[PDB]
Design an enzyme around this catalytic site. Structure first.
Site, PDB file in Angstrom:
ATOM      1  N   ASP A  81     -11.597   8.536  14.729  1.00 35.21           N
ATOM      2  CA  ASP A  81      -9.926   8.791  14.484  1.00 35.21           C
ATOM      3  C   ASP A  81      -9.439  10.145  15.267  1.00 35.21           C
ATOM      4  O   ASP A  81     -10.512  10.919  15.251  1.00 35.21           O
ATOM      5  CB  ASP A  81      -9.685   8.765  13.073  1.00 35.21           C
ATOM      6  CG  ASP A  81      -8.641   7.784  12.599  1.00 35.21           C
ATOM      7  OD1 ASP A  81      -8.069   7.222  13.422  1.00 35.21           O
ATOM      8  OD2 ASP A  81      -8.624   7.773  11.490  1.00 35.21           O
ATOM      9  N   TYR A  88       4.677  11.245   2.622  1.00 28.19           N
ATOM     10  CA  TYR A  88       4.085  11.476   3.971  1.00 28.19           C
ATOM     11  C   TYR A  88       4.784  12.200   4.833  1.00 28.19           C
ATOM     12  O   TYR A  88       6.134  12.107   4.920  1.00 28.19           O
ATOM     13  CB  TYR A  88       4.160   9.783   4.588  1.00 28.19           C
ATOM     14  CG  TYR A  88       2.924   9.427   5.542  1.00 28.19           C
ATOM     15  CD1 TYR A  88       2.105   8.827   4.756  1.00 28.19           C
ATOM     16  CD2 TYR A  88       2.994   9.848   6.702  1.00 28.19           C
ATOM     17  CE1 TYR A  88       0.721   8.424   5.684  1.00 28.19           C
ATOM     18  CE2 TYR A  88       1.703   9.384   7.587  1.00 28.19           C
ATOM     19  CZ  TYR A  88       0.702   8.829   7.056  1.00 28.19           C
ATOM     20  OH  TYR A  88      -0.369   8.549   7.728  1.00 28.19           O
ATOM     21  N   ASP A 133     -12.324   2.604  16.770  1.00 30.58           N
ATOM     22  CA  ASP A 133     -12.259   1.680  15.548  1.00 30.58           C
ATOM     23  C   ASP A 133     -11.034   0.556  16.479  1.00 30.58           C
ATOM     24  O   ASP A 133     -10.970   0.298  17.392  1.00 30.58           O
ATOM     25  CB  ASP A 133     -11.192   2.450  14.562  1.00 30.58           C
ATOM     26  CG  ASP A 133     -10.061   3.287  15.067  1.00 30.58           C
ATOM     27  OD1 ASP A 133     -10.190   4.066  15.795  1.00 30.58           O
ATOM     28  OD2 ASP A 133      -9.038   2.969  14.722  1.00 30.58           O
ATOM     29  N   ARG A 144       0.974  -1.066  -0.095  1.00 30.57           N
ATOM     30  CA  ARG A 144      -0.182   0.012   0.166  1.00 30.57           C
ATOM     31  C   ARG A 144       0.808   1.188   0.004  1.00 30.57           C
ATOM     32  O   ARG A 144       1.471   1.574   1.048  1.00 30.57           O
ATOM     33  CB  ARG A 144      -0.823  -0.033   1.051  1.00 30.57           C
ATOM     34  CG  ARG A 144      -2.402   0.757   0.908  1.00 30.57           C
ATOM     35  CD  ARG A 144      -2.943   1.330   2.114  1.00 30.57           C
ATOM     36  NE  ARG A 144      -4.254   1.951   1.846  1.00 30.57           N
ATOM     37  CZ  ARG A 144      -5.116   2.256   2.837  1.00 30.57           C
ATOM     38  NH1 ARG A 144      -4.635   2.131   4.363  1.00 30.57           N
ATOM     39  NH2 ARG A 144      -6.092   2.867   2.344  1.00 30.57           N
ATOM     40  N   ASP A 152      -3.401   6.825  16.576  1.00 38.58           N
ATOM     41  CA  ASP A 152      -2.419   7.610  15.451  1.00 38.58           C
ATOM     42  C   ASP A 152      -1.893   8.745  16.197  1.00 38.58           C
ATOM     43  O   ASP A 152      -2.399   9.680  16.883  1.00 38.58           O
ATOM     44  CB  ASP A 152      -3.074   8.161  14.346  1.00 38.58           C
ATOM     45  CG  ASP A 152      -4.098   6.953  13.943  1.00 38.58           C
ATOM     46  OD1 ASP A 152      -3.973   5.724  14.099  1.00 38.58           O
ATOM     47  OD2 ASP A 152      -4.967   7.224  12.966  1.00 38.58           O
TER      48      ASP A 152
END
Lengths: 280, 280
Positions: free
Chosen positions: A151, A88, A114, A77, A119
């Site tokens: 998130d 990124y 989730d 990915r 993160d």
């Protein structure tokens, strides 16, 4: 955690990253506390996505957890290189030791929670350490509601890196890195665009809180993961809990370290020229 | 030109880049034409600054010219990583075979001309080729007046790369890469900022012309360099003209190729962690 073993690769699909703690392997998300380093200060975090990188590696479901190039359609990915910016940027962490329960979403987070841990994005002058376990203090917190999934965004920095006593809240940055905010907001949406995923839609109208919301959000993050270790606690424990750092868990197989084959670092595998593509 | 030899390095200060043409060395700016490839089409160009790169290498004064990490204060010249963006984005070329005469500046270019050849920036999907001699067609042209120096900006792309018949003028981009313009304009100013050089100040109020101005600007670029080869033509010939591709120049030492020591590629030298620094 300490040092880690590089499973030669970097893309191919065999590059297995395994961080080692002191003298022996370890386990992120499990064998990686958090509220460590002046309980009244900050905590440590892990990295698995250095800045300017179209690659995306995680760590979950394998034994001790480890970053990877998530798949889905038989293939690595690779994150698009959205026009504005590069690949990124931000680094990325994942305050291991926490878990965003799919259900339980607190007030102001319909999309409940989730799976994946949490993160974390630290703006450390120095590059990332694909697994580099460095300290850092929490600043602000960002939330993003994508595909019914609660998130959040954490702000951490190399407490050792310059701009330490300089950054201790959201407001700051704006003055120090006035452009890191909105810069992160979107960049996320288009992140899915060139891939089949249109936009996302940040929560809280699109505003983020400060450390206060971070500390709490980060706090209720570990607990949710702690009250899980228990054993069956969670009605859905789809992952490897095994932890040799908690002789209080029917998964304390401190023998799951030696088993881990020694590192086998090879060489950065060439990445399709398709990546380095500025998707407008 | 063809292939080139990598003089192990990449920073250290010994990394000597030497491009080779067919079977034997070559010489950029001299042994590198331009109006080649369908005289009524485009021309070839050289690269010496891949996108997202704080490094800056040139090619002049050495014999056959070659990129490098310009110095001045005993040390490699590392371009700041300006907050917005990264290190070096655009690639960079240098339509070898031309020379911006310090004096003669045409109408609309007080700062007359400078030394270094010509600056070319191609937005090729694929990364750069630090010396990679690839084709490409000219699009628009940008000019920048810095430190009394007539600077211009060329727009070239891998005629072989996608978006070929798509890009043939300035207007375009805006639709294809709507954000590459103003994106380049500044980025240049701050480029000097974090280094001791404040802003610059683009010419033409700050507007750029199209291919028409490029072709011409690019045309009068080679001529100025051609009428130079002659011999003494230029009252100030501070550089190596030697060219084995012009048996019509008291510098046609086709023997200056074998002399060039074979390539000695080593390994990318580590770069001070000072670079990867987002200077706001």
């Amino acid at each position: 955690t300490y040092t880690t073993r590089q499973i030669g690769a970097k893309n191919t699909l065999e590059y297995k990253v395994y961080i080692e703690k002191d003298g022996k392997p370890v386990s992120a998300f499990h064998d990686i506390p958090l509220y460590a380093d002046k309980e009244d200060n900050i905590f440590n975090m892990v990295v698995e996505i250095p800045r300017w990188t179209n690659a995306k590696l995680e760590i979950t479901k394998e034994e001790t957890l480890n970053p990877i190039i998530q798949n889905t359609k038989g293939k690595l990915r690779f994150v698009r290189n959205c026009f504005p910016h590069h690949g990124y940027i931000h680094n990325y962490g994942a305050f291991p030791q926490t878990w965003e329960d799919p259900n339980v979403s607190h007030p102001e987070t319909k999309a409940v929670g989730d799976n994946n841990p949490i993160d974390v994005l630290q703006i450390g002058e120095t590059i990332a350490y694909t697994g580099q376990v460095k300290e850092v203090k929490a600043l602000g917190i960002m939330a993003l509601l994508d595909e019914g999934e609660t998130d959040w965004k954490v702000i951490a920095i190399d407490i050792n890196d310059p701009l330490a006593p300089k950054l201790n809240d959201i407001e700051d940055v704006e003055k120090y890195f006035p452009g890191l905010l909105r810069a992160t907001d979107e960049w996320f949406r288009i992140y899915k665009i060139p891939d089949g995923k249109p936009e996302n839609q940040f929560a809280f109208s699109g505003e983020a809180k400060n450390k206060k919301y971070a500390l709490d959000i980060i706090k209720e993050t570990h607990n949710s993961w702690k009250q899980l270790i228990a054993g069956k606690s969670s009605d859905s424990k789809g992952i490897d809990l095994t932890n040799v750092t908690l002789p209080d868990t029917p998964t304390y197989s401190k023998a799951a370290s030696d088993a881990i084959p020694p590192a086998s670092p090879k060489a950065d595998a060439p990445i399709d020229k398709s990546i380095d593509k500025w998707f407008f």
